[PDB]
Amino acid sequence: SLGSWLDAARDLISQNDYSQKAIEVE
Amino acid sequence: SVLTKAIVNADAEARYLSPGELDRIKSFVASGERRLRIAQTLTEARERIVKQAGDQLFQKRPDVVSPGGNAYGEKMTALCLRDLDYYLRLVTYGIVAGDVTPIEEIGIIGVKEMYNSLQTPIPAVAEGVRAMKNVATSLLSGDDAAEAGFYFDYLVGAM
Amino acid sequence: SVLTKAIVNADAEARYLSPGELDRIKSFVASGERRLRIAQTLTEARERIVKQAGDQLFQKRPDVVSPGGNAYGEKMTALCLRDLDYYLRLVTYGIVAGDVTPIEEIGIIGVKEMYNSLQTPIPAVAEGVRAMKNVATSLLSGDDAAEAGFYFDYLVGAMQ
Amino acid sequence: SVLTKAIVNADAEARYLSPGELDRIKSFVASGERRLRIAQTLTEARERIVKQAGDQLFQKRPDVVSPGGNAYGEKMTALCLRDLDYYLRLVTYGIVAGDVTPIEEIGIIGVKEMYNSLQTPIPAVAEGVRAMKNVATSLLSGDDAAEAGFYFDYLVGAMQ
Amino acid sequence: SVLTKAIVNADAEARYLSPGELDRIKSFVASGERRLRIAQTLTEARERIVKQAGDQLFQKRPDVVSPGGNAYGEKMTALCLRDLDYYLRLVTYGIVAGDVTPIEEIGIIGVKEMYNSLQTPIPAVAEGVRAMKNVATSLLSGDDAAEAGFYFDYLVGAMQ
Amino acid sequence: MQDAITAVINNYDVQGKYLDGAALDKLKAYFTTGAVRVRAAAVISSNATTIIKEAAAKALIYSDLTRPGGNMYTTRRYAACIRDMDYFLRYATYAMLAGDPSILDERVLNGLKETYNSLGVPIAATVGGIQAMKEVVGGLVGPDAAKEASIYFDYLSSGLS
Amino acid sequence: MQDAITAVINNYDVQGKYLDGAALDKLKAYFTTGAVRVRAAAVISSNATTIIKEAAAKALIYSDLTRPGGNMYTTRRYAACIRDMDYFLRYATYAMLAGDPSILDERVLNGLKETYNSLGVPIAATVGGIQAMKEVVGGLVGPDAAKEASIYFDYLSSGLS
Amino acid sequence: MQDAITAVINNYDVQGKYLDGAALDKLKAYFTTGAVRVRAAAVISSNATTIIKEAAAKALIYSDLTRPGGNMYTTRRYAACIRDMDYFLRYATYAMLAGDPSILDERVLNGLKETYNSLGVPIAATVGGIQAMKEVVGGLVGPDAAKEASIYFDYLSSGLS
Amino acid sequence: MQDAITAVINNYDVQGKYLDGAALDKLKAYFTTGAVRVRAAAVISSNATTIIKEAAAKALIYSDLTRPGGNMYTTRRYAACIRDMDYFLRYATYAMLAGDPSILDERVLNGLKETYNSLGVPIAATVGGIQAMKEVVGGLVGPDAAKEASIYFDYLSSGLS
Amino acid sequence: SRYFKVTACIPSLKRVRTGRELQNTFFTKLVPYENWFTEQQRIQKAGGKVLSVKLFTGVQGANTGV
Amino acid sequence: GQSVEVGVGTLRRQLEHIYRIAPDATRSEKDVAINAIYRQVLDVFAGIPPSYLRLSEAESKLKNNEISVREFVRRLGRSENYRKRFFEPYSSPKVVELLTKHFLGRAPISQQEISTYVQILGTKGLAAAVDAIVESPEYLTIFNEDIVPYRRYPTLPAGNYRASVRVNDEELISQSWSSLSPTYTGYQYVT
Ligand SMILES: *[C@H](C)[C@H]1/C(=C/c2[nH]c(/C=C3N=C(/C=C4\NC(=O)C(CC)=C4C)C(C)=C\3CCC(=O)O)c(CCC(=O)O)c2C)NC(=O)[C@@H]1C
Ligand SMILES: *[C@H](C)[C@H]1/C(=C/c2[nH]c(/C=C3N=C(/C=C4\NC(=O)C(CC)=C4C)C(C)=C\3CCC(=O)O)c(CCC(=O)O)c2C)NC(=O)[C@@H]1C
Ligand SMILES: *[C@H](C)[C@H]1/C(=C/c2[nH]c(/C=C3N=C(/C=C4\NC(=O)C(CC)=C4C)C(C)=C\3CCC(=O)O)c(CCC(=O)O)c2C)NC(=O)[C@@H]1C
Ligand SMILES: *[C@H](C)[C@H]1/C(=C/c2[nH]c(/C=C3N=C(/C=C4\NC(=O)C(CC)=C4C)C(C)=C\3CCC(=O)O)c(CCC(=O)O)c2C)NC(=O)[C@@H]1C
Ligand SMILES: *[C@H](C)[C@H]1/C(=C/c2[nH]c(/C=C3N=C(/C=C4\NC(=O)C(CC)=C4C)C(C)=C\3CCC(=O)O)c(CCC(=O)O)c2C)NC(=O)[C@@H]1C
Ligand SMILES: *[C@H](C)[C@H]1/C(=C/c2[nH]c(/C=C3N=C(/C=C4\NC(=O)C(CC)=C4C)C(C)=C\3CCC(=O)O)c(CCC(=O)O)c2C)NC(=O)[C@@H]1C
Ligand SMILES: *[C@H](C)[C@H]1/C(=C/c2[nH]c(/C=C3N=C(/C=C4\NC(=O)C(CC)=C4C)C(C)=C\3CCC(=O)O)c(CCC(=O)O)c2C)NC(=O)[C@@H]1C
Ligand SMILES: *[C@H](C)[C@H]1/C(=C/c2[nH]c(/C=C3N=C(/C=C4\NC(=O)C(CC)=C4C)C(C)=C\3CCC(=O)O)c(CCC(=O)O)c2C)NC(=O)[C@@H]1C
Ligand SMILES: *[C@H](C)[C@H]1/C(=C/c2[nH]c(/C=C3N=C(/C=C4\NC(=O)C(CC)=C4C)C(C)=C\3CCC(=O)O)c(CCC(=O)O)c2C)NC(=O)[C@@H]1C
């Protein structure tokens, strides 16, 4: 079921938005 | 394990174990208690290692978790985390065995084929393992950390 | 050596050295200092070890030092002791190397065939090595003696 | 080439060329004139094919032409176009040969390994070839396009 | 057949069928209708072809139909004709298949060994097949005759 | 193996009969179908990887099989399963060109059930995967081609079960 | 082959479970035994030829087997029998180090019965020879080691019979 | 090997040039010749044994070579010589179809002179035999074919000498 | 092959001398270096792919060699070149652990120059690529390790040239 | 092509070998048809016994496709 | 005075591993032996076959223990990659040298051995020559059905130890299998 992953993953998506960062060469 | 490897070489040469082979077994069994401790620490902190490494990975590669990206969507994101958890469990097995035989059969041979079909990018799975190393290493004593590091590095090499 | 053996296994697998194989190398380098001390002790006591072991062997087997026996006569007895000295030297090399590879190439391959031409009895030779182990063990510390024992045992195993 | 392949199989069997093999050679020589025309068309339109294909590829995959992506930067973008041009040249050689043998030795064997070192994504490359096929098909006559399609398809299949 | 051969080559390479291999299949299926007509013509004229070829062969080689010769006597002469009929039937099968694989299994492998036991001369048999070709060619259209010729030639090549 | 053309010749050779009109009609039938088959085969080869992916998504993945304790758990086993899928697809394509199911029996089907049973590979799931591939293939090839394609996929499925 | 450590790991991997304290305890148990096993193995290797000689004297030689018409009659057969004895001893030593009987099944035991039946080698006598070796080994290794050593010898004997 | 078509391709590929009209003209030239070559090849294959017999009669047999003390004396050596003749004929036929001498260089010509010198095979006689085959072949193939056939025979002869 | 420890032993064995303090000092020297070498080897193995990529970028690629006509032109040849680079790197790592260059002479360097000359592989460029790898490796391993690592890379380069 | 499945047991009667030879001694295997006649002979000369032969692939008495 | 690595030397022994596949064996053990087959018979110096070189159906039958290592080695030689890499570029006498090296581990013993195999190649396949060596008695004594072929430098026949050193240690392959895109001599230096 990956239930722990399902709740943790949405928690992660809500806390931070990846759709702006853009890749950094670093 | 160390045992399996030693025995297999001896059997192939149809001989009893060398003094060198015996010595390696002795050293390994002395290290056993320490190895079990390292594994236990990582097992306990599993959820943290995966999650913090996951966060770093998503920061490092925003694209994967983007509408265009493969990992996009919560279900997909969960699967990527599930994968990280699987790889962490494998590492612990390696540490207690003292070799990669368990790791290799379960997680690296045929790995190229599977991810390529899925279209998940491997030139990034390795990065996730690197990430996991950094987190895991911070929960270990310096000597313990080095031991653990080797196994993490092997995974990165194998991909 | 330990190193040689590890490299050879990696070459066969066509791989870089495994974490486990690297760990084995690490253990060997740590042990090295102790190993050197053990070897030095045996080197110093060599003359005594050979002589005492010879005596025990001759007590164990009167025959070798008898008219029928190969060892019979002064020259022959010396040669039998010389052989024991050679094996002791090899054992010391083995201890520092951490493997029998040095021992094996110099002394255990073709040994049967060599002794058979000479007509020397192989089991007696093995007894002489066992004798040498007992003498060596007494000089060595208990922990040291165990280490030394393995190498002595290998010789006995290889030629019997 | 068709010819090469037929001869090579016969040599291995140590036999003169079969009636069926001879027939296939006859068919190829008849088709040759058509094949040359198809190749010429693509050669003339090459600059256009590469450009149009490139555009489609970049539209389909923003990432390659992005800071993270391999293609990012003018030099890199040029190299990605250069690659597409190389693959088109290979395809033309294939059409005149009547086989992918020319294509395969120059471009498909070792391609994965080369791209993996470069870190270029192989699936993107495949997309670019697919793109090139679509453009090429439009220039070619329907019958011609089918012939040309097979060679393009082979490339796409191999780069996977 | 052409189909069998193409699939077998692909299976050895462990790959799906190449563009060139597919093209050869396409050409063959177009040719097929014509091939069927050629086969039908030969089947209808078979009795005549065998008879005429027999006569020419006996003209070419008086010896075979002589007391020493194998063909001598009615039963033996019938058997020689029966053999010619068998080879003609094989040729028809070959024409429709577009390949000699069917012919080869039934007629060309072990042929030397079979004839050697019988003591029939193999070169004479080849002459009979040549004879059959000449008769068959006359009945066939020039283009058709060329196609048929290849299969006849293969037989002559295979036993020589 | 045996193809449609050779199969006819095979049957006439045991009789010893020269090729006859009825036989010729069977050969004629194959020759008309042939063009369609060639087109279908090229479609399948180009889309082969996708066909396998789609079929796995439909049946194999996100399932108990992929989860630990399942026969497709571990990378090694996952990779073996998709390799077998590829085999089935390739052989079905060969059969479709040939117009004969014999090749499937000779190379794929013979001994497969017994091997699978010893391995512990689940036959039912495998059959399901073959059926899934057929559906995907059917779409790509188009209807006329699909009928021909379907019989070879069905032949594999029946053999396994 | 499989060893004690890997056997625990494999059992947890099929469950998908991370390693737990109960599992750790089994692993810990092996690690304490290990030192003793290594010492035992060295003893056996050094005395291997003697062990076989003593065991043969106890069971095989001075018997009908050695006498004409017996399986161990002729030099070729005598030599083959003591070669087999050496195999059993070597593999039991390997198993004792490993702490797992798997290697015996994988290499020694697999196909042995069938081969023996075709050869005409008498299984009962062979078993007797293995049991004899065990007793001799027991003496050399010492009591603590002997218990561990015994189970692998017993495992071989049961497999053969 | 490399055929005529691939030889053109290779020249352009090292330059990196796409195929051009001048290149296309060379390819076109080959395609007209092609049909003739195929006909010639079938003629040669059917008459292969005869061609070798006639050529041997012209040069090798009834000679000192066949007589005692000669390199083709003894059945073993006679048979080896006719085997070589057959190889030359087969490879020349392959070259004629290909329209390229490369195959001859890669397999037949490479190391042949040195081998012959160690064996003691006389090169001059061998060359003579090749030239004899050419003349016989020329007759069978017919004039248009003969010109093409001749160059490959000549290529072999020059290589050997 | 020979390693540092065995090299000392071999020198004493030809003399017939037992090991002495001077010899022991050389052995002692190796044992201190050893720990560093092990760490370096692990670094190189993990970063092996990267090392080769960087080295190729520095010397081989973006060059006439990659462009048509060049040895590293064609995918097949590109892949061969990076294959060889990986071999050299793996053996250098083995030499560094061993503390002796012997292994390089035996497996890596044997017949290499002559083979390269026949192939047309350019030696100078290869040497350049080895030197490039060394620089990259030097950075990863760190300075103490780098000195040790450098000598083996230099040994390879000198051999090839 | 036709294939045979073959089981055989082979003894070493000329020499005594230390390495494990069980895989050579009892060997079920698949043999191409064209190889079997040679492989049968080989087992017989060694004084092995051929326990079983079955035709895995191919049809009995087929004139073509063989 | 002479050292332990003087004549034959320590290395060539101990670089030789007998590999036997066991049915029970772990995949990681099995794959090391399979890789060794590829590296002896196709001369894969790097020791890990590129995927295009692999043959998968044969590997699956080997991992299933439906075929022997000997039968796998026979299949490899009848393979197309064998024929393109080793038969087609070479001349028949060199083809034979490569056969003995690849299967058998040694240089050809005699000119009489060379002549028999050359006559096979000319009259029958490459495959028929591959079948002959594997069927050969030498093959069956040294490797039988279980052992993967290894490099063995014999010494029993005269001249064979030298020859087998020259073929296994110095004759690296020096020709390109592929004909297309010949490399130009210049462009040696990278600028
Ligand atoms: C995370 C690093 C990347 C990512 C994640 C992602 N994973 C999957 C799906 C699968 N993961 C596995 C893999 C394993 N199964 C095993 O047995 C093992 C070894 C123990 C592993 C590593 C499986 C089987 C799947 C397929 C589906 C399933 O789990 O049943 C997905 C879904 C695949 C898809 O295309 O939908 C995803 C997205 N994606 C990224 O981009 C990260 C780099
Ligand atoms: C474009 C579709 C994609 C892309 C391409 C890309 N390629 C490079 C660099 C190289 N590509 C080649 C390839 C070839 N050499 C050959 O001989 C052949 C076959 C004839 C090919 C196709 C080579 C040799 C290079 C290396 C540089 C050189 O030419 O010397 C790059 C640049 C990467 C770099 O860091 O150099 C790129 C970007 N990349 C993508 O992401 C596109 C999808
Ligand atoms: C006498 C010349 C020397 C001698 C002999 C000796 N032999 C034994 C014991 C055995 N001898 C054999 C030998 C054979 N078995 C066979 O199948 C053949 C070939 C046909 C032979 C030659 C066997 C099997 C035995 C074991 C006992 C048994 O037969 O059951 C001994 C006894 C010693 C012991 O048991 O340890 C002896 C003394 N010994 C010498 O020193 C003489 C030079
Ligand atoms: C000795 C206690 C008894 C005995 C033994 C005996 N064995 C053979 C022949 C063979 N023995 C084996 C067994 C093994 N080979 C293996 O690889 C393994 C596993 C590691 C085993 C245990 C085999 C395969 C053979 C056949 C060929 C060979 O020599 O290896 C014989 C000879 C029989 C013959 O005629 O060949 C004998 C005598 N027989 C006794 O009577 C004793 C009780
Ligand atoms: C007589 C029993 C049959 C017969 C004979 C015949 N032979 C030839 C020609 C040749 N015969 C040989 C044979 C040998 N050379 C050797 O070295 C040996 C072994 C020592 C032998 C037996 C050779 C070399 C020739 C070729 C010509 C030459 O001598 O240089 C012919 C002529 C062939 C032709 O067709 O012109 C004949 C007739 N033929 C029969 O009909 C008898 C049954
Ligand atoms: C016949 C015209 C002349 C003749 C020939 C002859 N050749 C040999 C021996 C060899 N011939 C070759 C040549 C080839 N082998 C090949 O596979 C090819 C390429 C396809 C060729 C052209 C070789 C390599 C040999 C050596 C090994 C072998 O026999 O195969 C002999 C035998 C000499 C001996 O003593 O061995 C002979 C007689 N010699 C003549 O007299 C004619 C002028
Ligand atoms: C890379 C830096 C340069 C390069 C490499 C390159 N090598 C080949 C071909 C071969 N490489 C070797 C080398 C070895 N074989 C061995 O046995 C050993 C030592 C044990 C080595 C290191 C061999 C023998 C070959 C030939 C066959 C093979 O590929 O296995 C090529 C390809 C040549 C060809 O034409 O195919 C290349 C490109 N070349 C460069 O340009 C770089 C400077
Ligand atoms: C003994 C009188 C002297 C001696 C001999 C010696 N030889 C070797 C090594 C080899 N010997 C041979 C020689 C032969 N092989 C043959 O086929 C023949 C002809 C029938 C001979 C005579 C070979 C090829 C080797 C090398 C391979 C092998 O060991 O089998 C050595 C040892 C070298 C080594 O490193 O092992 C020695 C010592 N040397 C002396 O000191 C005597 C004067
Ligand atoms: C996938 C749909 C299902 C699945 C497959 C699966 N198969 C194996 C193992 C084997 N597969 C085969 C089958 C074949 N080999 C062939 O050559 C052919 C004919 C061309 C077939 C179809 C074989 C022989 C094996 C066994 C040995 C080998 O690995 O080659 C496994 C792996 C089992 C293992 O642990 O090795 C799997 C997973 N199983 C599933 O879960 C799917 C339902």
TrEMBL record, chain A:
Cell location: Cellular thylakoid membrane
Assigned protein family: Belongs to the phycobilisome linker protein family.
Protein name stated in the entry: Glr1262 protein
Organism in which the protein naturally occurs: Gloeobacter violaceus (strain ATCC 29082 / PCC 7421)
Shown stretch of the complete protein: 314 to 339 of 824
UniProtKB/TrEMBL annotation, chain B:
UniProt binding sites for (2R,3E)-phycocyanobilin 1: N70, C80
Gene field: apcA
UniProt keyword list: Antenna complex, Bile pigment, Chromophore, Electron transport, Membrane, Photosynthesis, Phycobilisome, Thylakoid, Transport
Compartment(s) where it occurs, according to its Swiss-Prot or TrEMBL record: Cellular thylakoid membrane; Membrane
Positions of post-translational N4-methylasparagine modification: N70
A biological-process GO annotation: photosynthesis
Binding positions for (2R,3E)-phycocyanobilin per the UniProt entry: C80, R82, D83
GO cellular component: a single term: phycobilisome
Entry-linked Gene3D superfamilies: Phycocyanins
Source organism (scientific name): Gloeobacter violaceus (strain ATCC 29082 / PCC 7421)
Protein name (record): Allophycocyanin alpha subunit
Topology in membrane: Peripheral membrane protein
One matching Pfam family: Phycobilisome
Family of the protein in this entry: Belongs to the phycobiliprotein family.
UniProt superkingdom: Bacteria
UniProtKB/TrEMBL annotation, chains C, D, E:
Residues annotated for (2R,3E)-phycocyanobilin 1 binding in this entry: N70, C80
InterPro entries: Globin-like_sf, Phycobilisome_asu/bsu, Phycobilisome_asu/bsu_sf
Keywords on record: Antenna complex, Bile pigment, Chromophore, Electron transport, Membrane, Photosynthesis, Phycobilisome, Thylakoid, Transport
Modified positions (N4-methylasparagine) in chain numbering: N70
GO biological processes: photosynthesis
Membrane topology value: Peripheral membrane protein
Protein location: Cellular thylakoid membrane; Membrane
Pfam families associated with the record: Phycobilisome
Cellular component GO terms, alphabetical: phycobilisome; plasma membrane-derived thylakoid membrane
Residues involved in (2R,3E)-phycocyanobilin binding: C80, R82, D83
Family: Belongs to the phycobiliprotein family.
Listed PANTHER family: ALLOPHYCOCYANIN ALPHA CHAIN (PTHR34011:SF2), PHYCOBILISOME 32.1 KDA LINKER POLYPEPTIDE, PHYCOCYANIN-ASSOCIATED, ROD 2-RELATED (PTHR34011)
Name the UniProt record assigns to this protein: Allophycocyanin alpha subunit
Encoding gene per record: apcA
From TrEMBL, chain J:
This protein's GO CC annotations: phycobilisome; plasma membrane-derived thylakoid membrane
Domain of life: Bacteria
Membrane topology classification: Peripheral membrane protein
Annotated signal sequence range: none
Keyword tags: Antenna complex, Membrane, Photosynthesis, Phycobilisome, Thylakoid
One of the Pfam families matching this protein, by short name: CpcD
Entry annotated with the keyword Membrane: yes
Gene3D superfamilies reported for this sequence: Allophycocyanin linker chain (domain)
Subcellular location per the Swiss-Prot or TrEMBL entry: Cellular thylakoid membrane
Biological process terms in GO annotation: photosynthesis
Boundaries of every CpcD-like domain copy: 1-56
Similarity field: Belongs to the phycobilisome linker protein family.
Summary of the function given for this chain in its UniProt record: Rod linker protein, associated with allophycocyanin. Linker polypeptides determine the state of aggregation and the location of the disk-shaped phycobiliprotein units within the phycobilisome and modulate their spectroscopic properties in order to mediate a directed and optimal energy transfer.
Protein name: Phycobilisome 7.8 kDa linker polypeptide, allophycocyanin-associated, core
